[PDB]
Design a protein around this motif. Structure first.
Motif, PDB file in Angstrom:
ATOM      1  N   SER A 145     -37.708 -16.883 -32.365  1.00  0.00           N
ATOM      2  CA  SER A 145     -37.095 -16.100 -33.442  1.00  0.00           C
ATOM      3  C   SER A 145     -37.437 -16.582 -34.855  1.00  0.00           C
ATOM      4  CB  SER A 145     -35.580 -16.089 -33.266  1.00  0.00           C
ATOM      5  OG  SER A 145     -35.031 -17.367 -33.515  1.00  0.00           O
ATOM      6  N   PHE A 146     -37.840 -17.842 -35.028  1.00  0.00           N
ATOM      7  CA  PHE A 146     -38.094 -18.453 -36.334  1.00  0.00           C
ATOM      8  C   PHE A 146     -39.508 -18.205 -36.872  1.00  0.00           C
ATOM      9  CE2 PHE A 146     -35.063 -22.228 -34.959  1.00  0.00           C
ATOM     10  CZ  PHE A 146     -33.935 -21.409 -35.082  1.00  0.00           C
ATOM     11  N   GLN A 147     -40.480 -17.916 -36.002  1.00  0.00           N
ATOM     12  CA  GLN A 147     -41.895 -17.684 -36.338  1.00  0.00           C
ATOM     13  C   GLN A 147     -42.507 -18.795 -37.202  1.00  0.00           C
ATOM     14  OE1 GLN A 147     -42.991 -13.592 -37.260  1.00  0.00           O
ATOM     15  NE2 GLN A 147     -41.152 -12.789 -36.403  1.00  0.00           N
ATOM     16  N   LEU A 148     -42.316 -20.049 -36.797  1.00  0.00           N
ATOM     17  CA  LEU A 148     -42.646 -21.213 -37.618  1.00  0.00           C
ATOM     18  C   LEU A 148     -44.154 -21.345 -37.887  1.00  0.00           C
ATOM     19  CD1 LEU A 148     -40.230 -23.780 -35.962  1.00  0.00           C
ATOM     20  CD2 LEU A 148     -39.908 -22.683 -38.137  1.00  0.00           C
ATOM     21  N   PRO A 149     -44.562 -21.780 -39.087  1.00  0.00           N
ATOM     22  CA  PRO A 149     -45.960 -21.986 -39.422  1.00  0.00           C
ATOM     23  C   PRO A 149     -46.544 -23.221 -38.736  1.00  0.00           C
ATOM     24  CG  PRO A 149     -44.625 -22.777 -41.245  1.00  0.00           C
ATOM     25  CD  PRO A 149     -43.718 -22.138 -40.211  1.00  0.00           C
ATOM     26  N   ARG A 150     -47.839 -23.177 -38.416  1.00  0.00           N
ATOM     27  CA  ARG A 150     -48.587 -24.297 -37.833  1.00  0.00           C
ATOM     28  C   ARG A 150     -48.772 -25.421 -38.838  1.00  0.00           C
ATOM     29  NH1 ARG A 150     -51.999 -19.644 -35.148  1.00  0.00           N
ATOM     30  NH2 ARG A 150     -51.181 -19.889 -33.095  1.00  0.00           N
ATOM     31  N   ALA A 166     -27.475 -13.512 -26.261  1.00  0.00           N
ATOM     32  CA  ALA A 166     -28.664 -14.241 -25.789  1.00  0.00           C
ATOM     33  C   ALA A 166     -28.716 -15.643 -26.395  1.00  0.00           C
ATOM     34  CB  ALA A 166     -29.941 -13.442 -26.072  1.00  0.00           C
ATOM     35  N   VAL A 167     -29.452 -16.554 -25.762  1.00  0.00           N
ATOM     36  CA  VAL A 167     -29.714 -17.921 -26.245  1.00  0.00           C
ATOM     37  C   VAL A 167     -30.643 -17.893 -27.459  1.00  0.00           C
ATOM     38  CG1 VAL A 167     -30.776 -20.158 -25.508  1.00  0.00           C
ATOM     39  CG2 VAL A 167     -29.361 -18.888 -23.953  1.00  0.00           C
ATOM     40  N   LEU A 168     -30.386 -18.708 -28.480  1.00  0.00           N
ATOM     41  CA  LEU A 168     -31.270 -18.845 -29.635  1.00  0.00           C
ATOM     42  C   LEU A 168     -32.517 -19.669 -29.284  1.00  0.00           C
ATOM     43  CD1 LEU A 168     -31.745 -18.346 -32.657  1.00  0.00           C
ATOM     44  CD2 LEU A 168     -30.462 -20.405 -33.108  1.00  0.00           C
ATOM     45  N   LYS A 169     -33.721 -19.126 -29.499  1.00  0.00           N
ATOM     46  CA  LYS A 169     -34.995 -19.828 -29.263  1.00  0.00           C
ATOM     47  C   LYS A 169     -35.854 -19.881 -30.522  1.00  0.00           C
ATOM     48  CE  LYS A 169     -35.017 -18.225 -24.450  1.00  0.00           C
ATOM     49  NZ  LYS A 169     -34.642 -16.796 -24.528  1.00  0.00           N
ATOM     50  N   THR A 170     -36.697 -20.902 -30.654  1.00  0.00           N
ATOM     51  CA  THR A 170     -37.672 -21.068 -31.754  1.00  0.00           C
ATOM     52  C   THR A 170     -38.635 -19.888 -31.909  1.00  0.00           C
ATOM     53  OG1 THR A 170     -39.018 -22.378 -30.272  1.00  0.00           O
ATOM     54  CG2 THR A 170     -37.691 -23.611 -31.776  1.00  0.00           C
TER      55      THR A 170
END
Lengths: 52, 51
Positions: free
Chosen positions: B7-12, B1-5
């Motif tokens: 997966s990172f669960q980035l903070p606001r 699969a393509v890597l998407k953001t």
């Protein structure tokens, strides 16, 4: 009290000349003197003219 | 699969400052001037009736 004496003597002229009452007791002066409100020229306010 | 953001669960990002609704101010502080007072109950003299 000194200031209030002067205005009590001023106000008396209106209460005598307009109404013919003694200011202290508010009763009418004894002689049936001439008073401005003796005039037969009265316009008397009905509930239609009241507010105009 | 393509890597998407995803997966990172980035903070606001926190943004500086606070948003607030304004408060209505005192009317009595504007319509009546403050008098200098010492601590305690005051007493004021009134004329009740004229001569």
């Amino acid at each position: 009290m000194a200031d209030l004496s002067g205005v009590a003597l001023g106000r008396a002229l209106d209460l005598i000349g307009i109404h013919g009452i003694n200011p202290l007791t508010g009763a009418a002066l004894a002689g049936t003197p001439p008073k401005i409100i003796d005039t037969t020229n009265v316009v008397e306010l009905t509930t239609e003219t009241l507010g105009l | 699969a393509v890597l998407k953001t995803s997966s990172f669960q980035l903070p606001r990002h926190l943004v500086p400052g606070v948003w607030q609704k304004a408060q209505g101010q005192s009317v009595l502080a504007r319509l009546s001037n403050a008098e200098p007072q010492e601590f305690g109950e005051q007493q004021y003299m009134t004329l009740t009736a004229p001569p």
